Design an enzyme around this catalytic site. Structure first.
Site, PDB file in Angstrom:
ATOM      1  N   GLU A 134     -15.572  39.287  48.223  1.00 58.65           N
ATOM      2  CA  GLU A 134     -14.600  39.899  49.128  1.00 58.65           C
ATOM      3  C   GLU A 134     -14.461  41.366  48.835  1.00 58.65           C
ATOM      4  OE1 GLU A 134     -10.716  38.351  50.844  1.00 58.65           O
ATOM      5  OE2 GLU A 134     -11.760  36.510  50.457  1.00 58.65           O
ATOM      6  N   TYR A 184     -16.999  42.247  60.263  1.00 59.01           N
ATOM      7  CA  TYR A 184     -15.791  42.658  59.539  1.00 59.01           C
ATOM      8  C   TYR A 184     -16.346  42.282  58.176  1.00 59.01           C
ATOM      9  CZ  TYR A 184     -11.591  42.707  56.781  1.00 59.01           C
ATOM     10  OH  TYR A 184     -10.659  43.046  55.798  1.00 59.01           O
ATOM     11  N   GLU A 243     -18.086  42.302  54.041  1.00 57.43           N
ATOM     12  CA  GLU A 243     -17.963  42.350  52.597  1.00 57.43           C
ATOM     13  C   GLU A 243     -19.293  42.272  51.841  1.00 57.43           C
ATOM     14  OE1 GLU A 243     -15.707  38.378  52.166  1.00 57.43           O
ATOM     15  OE2 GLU A 243     -17.198  38.216  50.585  1.00 57.43           O
ATOM     16  N   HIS A 271     -20.082  33.324  49.212  1.00 59.46           N
ATOM     17  CA  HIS A 271     -18.688  33.201  49.590  1.00 59.46           C
ATOM     18  C   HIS A 271     -18.842  32.574  50.967  1.00 59.46           C
ATOM     19  CE1 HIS A 271     -14.734  35.138  51.205  1.00 59.46           C
ATOM     20  NE2 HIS A 271     -14.562  33.987  50.624  1.00 59.46           N
ATOM     21  N   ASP A 276     -17.413  31.067  46.002  1.00 57.79           N
ATOM     22  CA  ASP A 276     -16.251  30.469  46.619  1.00 57.79           C
ATOM     23  C   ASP A 276     -16.876  29.675  47.725  1.00 57.79           C
ATOM     24  OD1 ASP A 276     -13.842  29.726  47.853  1.00 57.79           O
ATOM     25  OD2 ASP A 276     -13.646  31.509  48.966  1.00 57.79           O
ATOM     26  N   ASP A 293     -13.971  26.677  44.472  1.00 56.52           N
ATOM     27  CA  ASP A 293     -14.790  27.563  43.714  1.00 56.52           C
ATOM     28  C   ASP A 293     -15.624  26.783  42.769  1.00 56.52           C
ATOM     29  OD1 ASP A 293     -13.751  30.603  44.073  1.00 56.52           O
ATOM     30  OD2 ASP A 293     -12.033  29.335  44.180  1.00 56.52           O
ATOM     31  N   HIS A 336      -7.186  33.367  44.312  1.00 60.65           N
ATOM     32  CA  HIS A 336      -8.216  32.502  43.743  1.00 60.65           C
ATOM     33  C   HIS A 336      -8.314  32.640  42.240  1.00 60.65           C
ATOM     34  CE1 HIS A 336     -10.842  30.975  47.029  1.00 60.65           C
ATOM     35  NE2 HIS A 336     -10.219  31.916  47.686  1.00 60.65           N
TER      36      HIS A 336
END
Ligand SMILES: *[C@H]1O[C@H](CO)[C@@H](O[C@@H]2O[C@H](CO)[C@@H](O[C@@H]3O[C@H](CO)[C@@H](O)[C@H](O)[C@@H]3O)[C@H](O)[C@H]2NC(C)=O)[C@H](O)[C@H]1NC(C)=O
Ligand SMILES: Nc1ncnc2c1ncn2[C@@H]1O[C@H](COP(=O)(O)OP(=O)(O)OP(=O)(O)O)[C@@H](O)[C@H]1O
Ligand SMILES: [Ca+2]
Ligand SMILES: [Ca+2]
Ligand SMILES: [Ca+2]
Ligand SMILES: [Ca+2]
EC number: 3.1.21.1
Lengths: 372, 258
Positions: B39, B76, B78, B132, B166, B210, B250
Site C-alpha cells: 500500500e 489508483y 500502489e 496485496h 496481504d 495476511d 494490519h
C-alpha cells in the site's frame, strides 16, 4: 541529405532541453535539465543499479535522488553533469549516434569565451560529432521571426535578457540580464496561493502550482484597475480542479504573479523590471539604430507566454519612448520554441554549410576555431 | 533471518510526515532482516525516501531497497517495497510478474519477484513473491499465484519460493468452500505458515488475511518451528486502539529462517 536530414539542434536551458532535427517545425525532445543521483542503495524491480538519472526519470523518482541543475542562469556550471544531459539527449531521447550528425548548439548572451571553447572540446573530443556550431539564443529567436535587427526580450526558466541585435551581430555592451524568470514566478504564485488560505503540502500539490501558473495566469494591462475590478468581484475568478476533486479557486492572484515581471518589488527584488530594462538597453545603443530596435521588440521564452504580455509591454514602452517613435512588440505563438526553431531554420539552410566547424577545422586549429 | 510482510495503510508522504507515526514504522521495520511493505502510495517516491533516511542516518547501508513501479488496473495505484539488511542477504535478481497487462490480466497489482541470496541459513537461495490482493478478487488471485510460482521455477529453476502478502485470505473475502478452488492451497507443494486461526488485523475483525506460504524442501527445512506469526505492535508497544490503527489496520506477519 547527408546532413540535410542529419543536422541536430539542441537548445540547452536552465529548466528544459529542447532537441530534434533541423528541418522539423518543433523540438522532438523536451525534458528537464536535471541529473539525479540516488541517495540510497537499491533497485527498481527488473532494473539494475543505476548510478544516475536524467530528465523526467530524475523528476519522477525525485524522492530517492539528489537532484542537480547543470545550467545556472543559462550558463553551464557543472560540466560532468552537462555531458550526462547531452549523452541522454543523443542516445536515449533522439536515439541517434552523434558521430555521424552535425550538431547546432546554443549558448547564452554573454557566455564566457572559455565555455564556448569547452563545449566544443566535449562535442568533438568526447562525442566525436562530424561538425558543430554554437548560435547565441536571442539571435536565433530574432531570426526565426524573419528579421535581423531588433531587440529580443528573452525569458525562460532561470534568466531574462534583452539582446539588441543589428544585422545579426548581438550588441555586447547593450545586453541586460535580469535573474528573475518562470522558476521565481512559480514560487511566488505558490506563496500568494497558500496566502489565499491553501496548502500545497504533498509533492503532487507542489508540482501543479506550476500548471496553474501556465494555464490560468494573465498579464493584465492596467493592473491598477484590475485589482480594483477584483474587489467589485466580477466573474474574473477561476477554479482549477486538483489531481483529485479539491477544487481550488484563483480569482485575483492569477495576474498578481506576472505583475512580478514589471514590479520585481513584489519579490524583494530591487532591480528594474522587463519594460524599463527593454528601454534601458535601447538608450545604451547607438542613436541611429534606436528607431529599428523600437519597431522590433521580439519576444521569446516560456515565461513571455502569459497572455496580454505584449499589450502591457506595448503600452509600457510607448509611454517611455519619445512620441516621434514607432513601438512594435512582436510576440509569436510558437515563442516557447523560437530559439529552437531559429536554429532548425538556420541549420537546415542552404547557406549555413560553410559555417559548420568541422573536425578538420578543430583537429587543426584547437577550440579557438569555433570560439570566433 | 527474520522475514516479514507489512501492509501499512496508505504509506505515503503524509504518513511519513507525522513524527510519532514515522517513529513507530521505523521501529517495527528495524525488527526484520527482510521486510515487504504494501500500500505504498508514493508517486515521486518521497515517502520511501524519508523512510530510508531514517533507517540509514548512521550507517549509509543499514538497508537497501527494491521498489516496484505503481501497480493497478483500477488506476489508483500502489507499489511493492522490499527493504533488506545488506549485511544479511543480497539480491541476486528481480522481475515483475507478467500478468497479461486488454481485459485478461490476472492481478490488480502484479507480484514483484525478488531472488535473494542468504549465507547464514540452510536455504542459501530463495525467491520471495509479493502480493496485496484485490479483496474482491482474492480467490482468483491467491490461485493465480500458483502460476507465478511456476514462472519462478521456469525462469529461475528455483523451488524454494516464499509467497507472502496481504492475501485478503479469510472472513468474507475467502470462505471454507472457496479454498477448494485455490491450487496454492490444494497442492501439498506449499506449506501455509500463518494458519486460518490467526488474526492479522489491527481492527476488531479476526481474519488471517495476511499470509506467508513456503514451497521448496530446503526453504521449509529452514523455517524455525512456530516463529511464524503476526506481530501485535499495539499489544507489544502498549499502543492505544487509536494509535495502533493510526499506524495500520494490519499487523506484520513474520517468520524466522535458520
Ligand atoms: C499523528 O498522530 C496522531 C494519531 O493519528 C494524531 O492525532 C492523535 O489523536 C488525537 C486527534 O488528532 C490527538 O489529540 C487531540 O487534541 C486536540 C486538542 O485539544 C483535541 O481537540 C482532540 O479531541 C484530540 O484529543 C492526539 O494528539 C493524537 N494522539 C497521540 C497519541 O498523539 C496527531 O494529530 C498526528 N500528529 C501530526 C503531526 O499530524
Ligand atoms: N504557458 C506558459 N506560461 C508561463 N510560463 C511558461 C509557460 N510555458 C512555459 N513557461 C515557463 O518557462 C520556463 C521554461 O521556459 P524556457 O524553455 O524558455 O526556459 P529555459 O530555456 O529552460 O531556461 P533559461 O532561463 O536558461 O532560458 C518554466 O518556468 C516554464 O514554466
Ligand atoms: Ca533559453
Ligand atoms: Ca495487471
Ligand atoms: Ca484483530
Ligand atoms: Ca480466521
Amino acid at each position: 541529405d547527408e546532413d540535410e536530414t542529419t543536422a541536430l539542434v539542441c537548445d540547452n536551458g536552465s529548466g528544459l532541453v529542447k532537441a530534434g532535427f533541423a528541418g522539423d517545425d518543433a523540438p522532438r525532445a523536451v525534458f528537464p535539465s536535471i541529473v539525479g543521483r540516488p541517495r540510497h542503495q537499491g533497485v527498481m524491480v527488473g532494473m539494475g543499479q543505476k548510478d544516475s538519472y536524467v530528465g523526467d526519470e530524475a523528476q519522477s523518482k525525485r524522492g530517492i535522488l539528489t537532484l542537480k541543475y547543470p545550467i545556472e542562469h543559462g550558463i553551464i556550471t557543472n560540466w560532468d553533469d552537462m555531458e550526462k544531459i547531452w549523452h541522454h539527449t543523443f542516445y536515449n531521447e533522439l536515439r541517434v549516434a552523434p558521430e555521424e550528425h552535425p550538431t547546432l548548439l546554443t549558448e547564452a548572451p554573454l557566455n564566457p569565451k572559455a565555455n564556448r571553447e569547452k563545449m566544443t572540446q566535449i562535442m568533438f573530443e568526447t562525442f566525436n560529432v562530424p561538425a558543430m556550431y554554437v548560435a547565441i539564443q536571442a539571435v536565433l529567436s530574432l531570426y526565426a521571426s524573419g528579421r535581423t535587427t531588433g531587440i529580443v526580450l528573452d525569458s525562460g526558466d532561470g534568466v531574462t535578457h534583452n539582446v539588441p541585435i543589428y544585422e545579426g551581430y548581438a550588441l555586447p555592451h547593450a545586453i541586460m540580464r535580469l535573474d528573475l524568470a518562470g522558476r521565481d514566478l512559480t514560487d511566488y504564485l505558490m506563496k500568494i496561493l497558500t496566502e489565499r488560505g491553501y496548502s500545497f503540502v504533498t509533492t503532487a500539490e507542489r508540482e501543479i502550482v506550476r500548471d496553474i501558473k501556465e494555464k490560468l495566469c494573465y498579464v493584465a494591462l492596467d493592473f491598477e484597475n484590475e485589482m480594483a475590478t477584483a474587489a467589485s468581484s466580477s466573474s474574473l475568478e477561476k477554479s482549477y480542479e486538483l489531481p483529485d476533486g479539491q477544487v481550488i479557486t484563483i480569482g485575483n492572484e492569477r495576474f498578481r504573479c506576472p505583475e512580478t515581471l514589471f514590479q520585481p518589488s513584489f519579490i524583494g527584488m530591487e532591480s528594474a523590471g522587463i519594460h524599463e530594462t527593454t528601454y534601458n538597453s535601447i538608450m545604451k545603443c547607438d542613436i541611429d539604430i534606436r528607431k529599428d530596435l523600437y519597431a522590433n521588440n521580439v519576444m521569446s521564452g516560456g515565461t513571455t507566454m502569459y497572455p496580454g504580455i505584449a499589450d502591457r509591454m506595448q503600452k509600457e514602452i510607448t509611454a517611455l519612448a519619445p512620441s516621434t517613435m514607432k513601438i512594435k512588440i512582436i510576440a509569436p505563438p510558437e515563442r516557447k520554441y523560437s530559439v529552437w526553431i531559429g536554429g532548425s531554420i538556420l541549420a537546415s539552410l542552404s547557406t549555413f554549410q560553410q559555417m559548420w566547424i568541422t573536425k578538420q577545422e578543430y583537429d587543426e586549429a584547437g577550440p579557438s576555431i569555433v570560439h570566433r | 533471518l527474520k522475514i516479514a510482510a507489512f501492509n501499512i495503510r496508505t504509506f505515503g508522504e503524509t504518513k511519513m510526515s507525522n513524527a510519532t507515526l514515522a517513529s513507530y514504522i521505523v521501529r517495527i521495520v528495524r525488527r526484520y532482516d527482510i521486510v515487504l511493505i504494501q500500500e505504498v502510495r508514493d508517486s515521486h517516491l518521497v515517502a520511501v525516501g524519508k523512510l530510508l533516511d531514517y533507517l540509514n542516518q548512521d550507517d549509509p547501508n543499514t538497508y537497501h531497497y527494491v521498489v516496484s513501479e505503481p501497480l493497478g488496473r483500477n488506476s489508483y495505484k500502489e507499489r511493492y517495497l522490499f527493504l533488506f539488511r545488506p549485511n544479511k542477504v543480497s539480491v541476486l535478481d528481480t522481475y515483475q510478474y507478467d500478468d497479461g497487462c486488454c481485459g485478461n490480466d490476472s492481478f490488480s497489482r502484479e507480484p514483484a519477484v525478488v531472488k535473494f541470496s542468504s549465507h547464514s541459513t540452510k536455504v542459501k537461495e530463495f525467491a520471495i513473491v509479493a502480493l496485496h490482493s484485490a479483496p474482491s478478487d482474492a480467490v482468483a488471485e491467491i490461485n493465480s499465484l500458483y502460476d507465478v510460482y511456476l514462472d519462478v521455477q521456469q525462469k529461475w529453476h528455483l523451488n524454494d519460493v516464499m509467497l507472502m502478502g496481504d492475501f485478503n485470505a479469510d472472513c468474507s473475502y475467502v470462505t471454507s468452500s472457496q479454498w477448494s478452488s485455490i491450487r496454492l492451497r490444494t497442492s501439498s507443494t506449499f506449506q501455509w505458515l500463518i494458519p486460518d486461526s490467526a488474526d492479522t488485523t489491527a481492527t476488531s475483525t479476526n481474519c488471517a488475511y495476511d499470509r506467508i506460504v513456503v514451497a521448496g524442501s530446503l526453504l521449509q527445512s529452514s523455517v524455525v518451528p512456530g516463529s511464524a506469526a503476526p506481530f501485535d505492535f499495539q499489544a507489544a508497544y502498549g499502543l492505544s486502539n487509536e494509535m495502533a490503527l493510526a499506524i495500520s489496520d494490519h499487523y506484520p506477519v513474520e517468520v524466522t529462517l535458520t
